[PDB]
Amino acid sequence: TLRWQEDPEPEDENLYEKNPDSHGYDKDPAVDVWNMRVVFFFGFSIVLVLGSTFVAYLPDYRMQEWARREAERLVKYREAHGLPLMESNCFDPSKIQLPED
Amino acid sequence: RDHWIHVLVPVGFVFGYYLDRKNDEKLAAFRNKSLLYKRELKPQEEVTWK
Amino acid sequence: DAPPLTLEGIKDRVLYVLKLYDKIDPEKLSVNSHFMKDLGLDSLDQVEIIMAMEDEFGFEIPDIDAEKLMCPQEIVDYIADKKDVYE
Amino acid sequence: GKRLFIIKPSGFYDKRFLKLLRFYILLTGIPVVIGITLINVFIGEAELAEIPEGYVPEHWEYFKHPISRW
Amino acid sequence: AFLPSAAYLTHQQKVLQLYKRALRHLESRCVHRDKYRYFACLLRARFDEHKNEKDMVKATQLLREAEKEFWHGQHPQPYIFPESPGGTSYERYECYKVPEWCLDDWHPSEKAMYPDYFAKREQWKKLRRESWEREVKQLQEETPVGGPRTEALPPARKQGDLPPLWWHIVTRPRERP
Amino acid sequence: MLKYIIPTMMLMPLTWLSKNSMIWINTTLHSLLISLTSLLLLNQFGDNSLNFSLTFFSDSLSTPLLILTMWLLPLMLMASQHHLSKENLARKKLFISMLILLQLFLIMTFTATELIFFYIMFEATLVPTLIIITRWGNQTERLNAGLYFLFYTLAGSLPLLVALIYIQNTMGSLNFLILQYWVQPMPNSWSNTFMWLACMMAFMVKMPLYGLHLWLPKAHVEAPIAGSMVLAAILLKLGGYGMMRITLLLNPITDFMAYPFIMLSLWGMIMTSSICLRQTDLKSLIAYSSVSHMALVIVAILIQTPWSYMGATALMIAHGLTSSMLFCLANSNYERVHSRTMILARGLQTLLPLMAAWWLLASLTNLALPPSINLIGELFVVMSTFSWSNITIILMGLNMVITALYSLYMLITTQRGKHTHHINNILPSFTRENALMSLHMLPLLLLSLNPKIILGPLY
Numbered sequence: 001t002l003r004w005q006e007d008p009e010p011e012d013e014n015l016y017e018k019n020p021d022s023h024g025y026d027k028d029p030a031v032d033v034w035n036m037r038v039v040f041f042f043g044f045s046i047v048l049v050l051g052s053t054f055v056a057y058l059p060d061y062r063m064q065e066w067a068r069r070e071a072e073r074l075v076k077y078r079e080a081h082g083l084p085l086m087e088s089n090c091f092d093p094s095k096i097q098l099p100e101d
Numbered sequence: 102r103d104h105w106i107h108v109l110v111p112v113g114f115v116f117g118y119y120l121d122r123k124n125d126e127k128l129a130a131f132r133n134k135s136l137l138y139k140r141e142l143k144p145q146e147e148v149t150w151k
Numbered sequence: 152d153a154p155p156l157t158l159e160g161i162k163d164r165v166l167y168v169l170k171l172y173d174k175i176d177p178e179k180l181s182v183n184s185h186f187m188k189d190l191g192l193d194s195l196d197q198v199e200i201i202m203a204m205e206d207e208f209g210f211e212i213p214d215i216d217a218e219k220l221m222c223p224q225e226i227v228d229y230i231a232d233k234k235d236v237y238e
Numbered sequence: 239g240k241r242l243f244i245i246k247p248s249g250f251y252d253k254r255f256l257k258l259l260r261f262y263i264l265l266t267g268i269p270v271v272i273g274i275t276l277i278n279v280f281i282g283e284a285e286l287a288e289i290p291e292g293y294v295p296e297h298w299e300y301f302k303h304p305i306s307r308w
Numbered sequence: 309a310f311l312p313s314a315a316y317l318t319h320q321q322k323v324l325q326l327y328k329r330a331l332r333h334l335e336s337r338c339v340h341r342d343k344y345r346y347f348a349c350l351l352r353a354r355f356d357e358h359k360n361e362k363d364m365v366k367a368t369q370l371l372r373e374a375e376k377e378f379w380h381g382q383h384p385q386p387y388i389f390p391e392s393p394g395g396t397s398y399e400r401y402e403c404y405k406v407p408e409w410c411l412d413d414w415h416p417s418e419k420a421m422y423p424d425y426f427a428k429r430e431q432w433k434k435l436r437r438e439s440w441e442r443e444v445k446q447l448q449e450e451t452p453v454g455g456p457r458t459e460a461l462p463p464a465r466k467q468g469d470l471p472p473l474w475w476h477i478v479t480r481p482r483e484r485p
Numbered sequence: 486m487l488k489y490i491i492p493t494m495m496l497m498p499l500t501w502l503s504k505n506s507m508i509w510i511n512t513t514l515h516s517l518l519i520s521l522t523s524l525l526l527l528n529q530f531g532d533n534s535l536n537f538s539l540t541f542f543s544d545s546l547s548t549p550l551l552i553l554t555m556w557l558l559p560l561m562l563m564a565s566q567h568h569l570s571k572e573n574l575a576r577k578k579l580f581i582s583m584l585i586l587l588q589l590f591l592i593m594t595f596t597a598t599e600l601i602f603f604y605i606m607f608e609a610t611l612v613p614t615l616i617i618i619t620r621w622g623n624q625t626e627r628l629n630a631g632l633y634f635l636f637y638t639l640a641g642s643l644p645l646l647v648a649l650i651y652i653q654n655t656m657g658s659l660n661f662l663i664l665q666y667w668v669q670p671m672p673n674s675w676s677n678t679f680m681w682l683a684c685m686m687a688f689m690v691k692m693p694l695y696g697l698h699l700w701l702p703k704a705h706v707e708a709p710i711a712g713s714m715v716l717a718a719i720l721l722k723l724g725g726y727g728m729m730r731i732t733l734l735l736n737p738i739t740d741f742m743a744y745p746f747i748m749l750s751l752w753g754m755i756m757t758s759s760i761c762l763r764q765t766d767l768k769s770l771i772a773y774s775s776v777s778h779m780a781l782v783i784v785a786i787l788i789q790t791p792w793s794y795m796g797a798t799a800l801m802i803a804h805g806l807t808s809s810m811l812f813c814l815a816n817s818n819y820e821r822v823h824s825r826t827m828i829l830a831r832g833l834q835t836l837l838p839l840m841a842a843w844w845l846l847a848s849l850t851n852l853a854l855p856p857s858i859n860l861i862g863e864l865f866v867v868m869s870t871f872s873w874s875n876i877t878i879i880l881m882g883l884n885m886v887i888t889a890l891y892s893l894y895m896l897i898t899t900q901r902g903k904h905t906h907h908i909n910n911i912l913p914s915f916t917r918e919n920a921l922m923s924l925h926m927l928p929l930l931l932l933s934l935n936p937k938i939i940l941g942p943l944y
């Protein structure tokens with residue numbers, strides 16, 4: 001009648017029972033402490049603080065500042081000599097050929 | 102060394118950087134030949150970039 | 152705010168409210184006096200007593216617990232259990 | 239004055255985590271901000287100048303901050 | 309017809325509950341105490357007029373017409389006690405009713421701040437775990453064949469033992485934690 | 486890209502030559518070091534993309550996905566080291582090797598300059614994911630979840646390869662740098678119609694699309710925590726990346742072709758949000774929310790405007806982080822109560838205050854509270870789809886309400902109200918779990934300060 005000879009389902013294990021100072025990494029306290037130290041050092045003191053410092057001081061990302069500064073020059077050109085600020089044609093009309101129509 | 106398993110990833114990163122630098126020299130068919138950045142060579146300089 | 156209630160205070164209050172009832176003469180009732188036999192009250196009078204204590208103590212007693220309360224000691228014990236007195 | 243015990247869940251573990259998080263953030267937050275302030279005060283920022291004739295700047299000489307140049 | 313101990317509501321309980329609800333709604337209708345007292349005496353007369361009615365179906369029809377009368381003229385917003393369900397202060401402090409077993413998960417550093425209380429807690433736990441098998445054997449030998457009929461629990465009929473299933477009712481959190 | 490592939494491949498001798506119980510520490514440490522070195526890919530120019538060699542190149546679109554993947558691997562190892570504590574050492578090493586191999590294929594997928602190489606890695610990501618789902622799951626239905634996840638994707642991807650090979654016989658090359666200059670307009674014909682279908686239906690399947698989304702509620706709720714993270718935060722973005730790469734060749738036929746899929750996604754977001762309003766499972770709720778957000782990304786890519794592309798990539802990154810956090814929250818609750826029912830464990834704020842704070846913060850970032858990048862992406866997609874048509878805002882706006890109708894609901898049933906009486910195994914929050922949620926959230930909150938690094942290749 002006893003179909004499927006099977007080990008009984010084990011109960012849940014509480015990590016705080018055998019070690020009340022468990023961080024939740026391993027049941028061995030020294031390995032758990034060292035894993036906690038490694039995670040908190042290389043997860044917050046290395047890749048977050050120094051990572052955010054590296055991202056904050058990026059050297060002119062996508063030249064987003066430079067395109068401003070050159071524009072600051074360029075307007076000061078065409079406002080000085082009476083030229084229009086921007087032409088309606090991106091390319092020069094003299095160097096482009098149209099099909100006959 | 103008693104911690105020889107901790108110098109596998111950094112040595113791999115150094116090797117990858119060295120292989121990148123080696124591969125960059127093989128792709129130098131247009132070094133100082135582009136129409137935008139061509140320039141006469143400065144004194145005490147033999148290539149524009151490595 | 153919300154001064155604590157003792158068993159003596161609850162018993163004094165329930166005896167005061169029962170003493171201010173015209174159907175119950177004050178010289179005969181006791182704390183262990185039954186409403187139906189010892190005092191000769193009615194079921195409607197029991198409902199009136201229950202709602203009088205409800206309005207006196209500021210909290211509502213459910214009907215299933217109100218129908219089983221027939222003596223002042225039972226009312227004192229019920230209010231003591233509900234208000235968690237004598238801590 | 240008849241003080242009663244207040245039952246609450248154990249806040250020791252959450253407080254320990256928050257203390258460890260604050261310590262491990264500040265441990266490299268303080269030297270980084272100290273070095274950044276010392277660089278900004280003493281080394282300082284660059285200045286915008288026109289390119290002189292016969293000279294071409296390096297690829298890292300087009301940026302203002304010392305950290306960006308580095 | 310939903311009761312913890314009984315299976316139905318008798319006629320007397322129906323009349324008493326109708327009288328209580330009608331008096332509460334009448335108190336809600338007239339604000340002042342003297343007017344409420346006058347109309348409560350009037351309602352007491354109306355209920356006392358038909359007290360000694362031995363005809364059962366006439367009592368049933370009187371109950372039905374009184375229920376229709378109450379439903380016709382009840383207050384749209386009756387007065388609700390603050391701790392009563394539907395009140396303003398109902399189940400407000402359930403966010404502070406921390407169960408007792410959380411004290412089993414406390415750290416030993418914060419368990420040393422209250423030594424005597426935790427000693428008494430250990431004594432309580434020892435009492436519960438030594439009386440549990442006795443009270444479950446009391447329950448299993450008193451419940452009839454086919455399970456219990458009602459939800460009423462037997463008391464402690466012996467000397468030295470506790471009533472069965474006493475832990476979660478005795479150790480419930482207070483109304484003002 | 487050889488400086489990132491080699492340490493990732495060297496992670497396997499690290500995890501196989503380690504000690505008896507030092508595999509997790511070493512793998513987490515070295516994967517965090519790889520994540521630190523991943524920031525060198527931010528050398529982006531306003532006109533030119535970063536080209537490394539003839540095989541690998543990195544634009545400003547693949548770079549946030551690469552950084553997210555190499556950041557997600559240590560979080561994955563931290564998440565999947567509690568339910569495997571009873572596992573065999575060889576099986577534990579096999580699981581870690583599976584995660585490492587999957588991450589390697591993912592970081593080789595995004596940098597591929599050839600569409601055939603990209604497609605090869607895009608299907609090579611299937612095998613470790615399927616193995617993880619079918620081996621280290623918990624329920625029976627994972628076996629069924631191993632089929633619907635597989636034979637859907639290949640059914641979209643096996644025609645597409647043929648279309649890609651056709652390009653190899655038509656344009657002469659499949660290199661993305663070449664195809665940006667040798668592209669040709671696509672005339673209206675039935676052949677180009679079916680070529681558009683072949684090139685798109687794989688990415689509609691893997692995103693997923695409403696109607697074709699049936700594999701995602703099945704492959705999310707039987708999979709383990711690491712599998713749920715890899716499906717939610719990375720593997721749904723392969724379809725978006727493939728769409729953004731392949732839309733260039735499919736012009737101008739896309740203008741009248743994108744209509745039925747746009748309508749399908751615009752109704753599917755409402756349908757999946759309404760489904761989220763009545764789901765009894767936390768994991769299924771997160772899966773259907775992922776379906777809704779990816780339908781929004783599908784609309785954004787299909788209307789193909791610069792604001793839509795910017796909102797699409799911002800929504801991709803933000804949804805990946807938020808869905809990963811929500812799945813880790815669900816995993817912690819499942820590990821504590823040993824069930825997936827939403828209504829089972831209620832009133833957890835009175836027991837876990839810090840987990841309640843994390844739940845509130847994750848639900849806050851789910852409904853796109855400004856100025857988070859979720860609001861940035863969703864807002865920009867809304868602006869672009871209002872430019873597309875003036876009525877679609879209604880189909881956006883109502884959806885927003887339903888979002889705020891379930892996420893807070895997902896909060897309340899799990900956090901507020903009277904606690905259940907018969908559950909007394911509620912342990913306090915571990916340091917590992919809190920570390921996991923902080924590592925999930927703090928980059929997401931920090932990215933609001935500088936969002937210009939996740940605004941696509943046309944910022």
Ligand SMILES: CCCCCCCCCCCCCCCCCC(=O)OC[C@H](COP(=O)([O-])OCC[N+](C)(C)C)OC(=O)CCCCCCCCCCCCCCCCC
Nearest residue numbers: 047048051052055056057549552553556928931932934935
């Ligand atoms: C990217 C895709 C993958 C995603 C996952 C990534 C995982 C790895 C993460 C690595 C680390 C993080 C990288 C991103 C860093 C983003 C942050 C950053 O550096 O930003 C750059 C930006 C740069 O600013 P900027 O660009 O304006 O400045 C010009 C540039 N520099 C700095 C060189 C001059 O930094 C800041 O804005 C910092 C400003 C100072 C600090 C903040 C001050 C205010 C703080 C709040 C005050 C109170 C407000 C009210 C509060 C009320 C209560 C709530």
